[PDB]
């Protein structure tokens, strides 16, 4: 995967993590 | 087709929010 | 020191560990 | 900051996040 695609995936995982933490 | 620097800026903002929220959750 | 790709690999593994802990919290 | 320095800082923040999650559990 390109660096750009990898960073996009990292951003998506961070969005998920943040969403889960906000429900606590 | 976002630039790498713009993607890093978004990642950095999300990390900052995650850290602030986790510290808040850890308050006794 | 680390190449950009090696740093990304480390970041990706830490994210997997974080997500794994979130599903098993409490 | 260079991209390499920004990624190093991101990695450090992720390590801190892991520590905070471990304490929370």
Author numbering:
A (entry chain D): 170 to 193
B (entry chain C): 169 to 196
C (entry chain A): 169 to 194
D (entry chain B): 170 to 194
Show sentences the authors wrote.
In HMPV and RSV a central oligomerization domain facilitates the formation of P tetramers.
Although we were not able to grow crystals of a complex, crystals which later proved to harbour only the P oligomerization region could be obtained after extended time periods. Serendipitously, we obtained two additional crystal forms of Pcore with improved resolution, allowing us to build a higher quality model (100% Ramachandran favoured). The first crystal (form 1, space group P21) diffracted to a resolution of 1.6 Å, while the second crystal (form 2, space group P212121) gave rise to diffraction data up to 2.2 Å. The P21 crystal (form 1) of HMPV Pcore grew at 20 °C after 291–344 days with mother liquor containing 20% polyethylene glycol (PEG) 6000, 200 mM NaCl, and 100 mM Tris, pH 8.0. Diffraction data were recorded on beamlines I03 (P21 crystal) and I04 (P212121 crystal) at Diamond Light Source, Didcot, UK. Mapping of the sequence conservation within the Pneumoviridae onto Pcore reveals the strict conservation of the hydrophobic amino acids (Leu and Ile residues) lining the interior of the coiled-coil, indicating that all family members share a similar P oligomerization region (strictly conserved residues in purple).
